[PDB]
Design a protein around this ligand. Sequence first.
Ligand SMILES: [Ca+2]
Ligand SMILES: [Ca+2]
Ligand SMILES: [Ca+2]
Ligand SMILES: [Ca+2]
Ligand SMILES: [K+]
Length: 203
Amino acid sequence: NRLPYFINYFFDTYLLISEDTPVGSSVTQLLARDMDNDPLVFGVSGEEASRFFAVESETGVVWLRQPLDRETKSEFTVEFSVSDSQGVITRKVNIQVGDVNDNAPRFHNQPYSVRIPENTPVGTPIFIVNATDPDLGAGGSVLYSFQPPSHFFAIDSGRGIVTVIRELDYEVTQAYQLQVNATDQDKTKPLSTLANLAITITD
Ligand SMILES: [Ca+2]
Ligand SMILES: [Ca+2]
Ligand SMILES: [Ca+2]
Ligand SMILES: [Ca+2]
Ligand SMILES: [K+]
């Protein structure tokens, strides 16, 4: 009797699985060979491996038992088994969890507020907003704006720097309620978050 062996590329490199792979989806099919043409039993071992993946014992079909989340865990080492019902052969697979855009930007150092004088010249930068997005590429890449846009203030869309763009007036207005929007730039489903910025005016 000669022991069976896996032939899938991913035993030598890695298996890529999108984090939005739905529960129940088949992620792949283990392929193995046996010079005795024996029937073959496929399996998965590991506390962690078995909570995430199930293996059809007859067909080698691997399906997902639990949602993946790249931002929680971007890699697994998983152990697959194939048996010729005489000896058990185990072999490790590195799993890369592929990104989708599933996080909105996250503001930092809130609550946001600044006090400025009314004579504050046009152009003067008065505040820095900061939001991070953990997704990759366009989905992880933050743009800033006011919602709605301001007649009196502006925010650099790259850097989140708030400037004064028209002369203020204490006799007329003492406060400003201002909503900052931070969106990511995912092509199909951009996500966004909102923050208050409070601007007191002094004499
Ligand atoms: Ca065999
Ligand atoms: Ca995620
Ligand atoms: Ca993601
Ligand atoms: Ca995102
Ligand atoms: K990022």
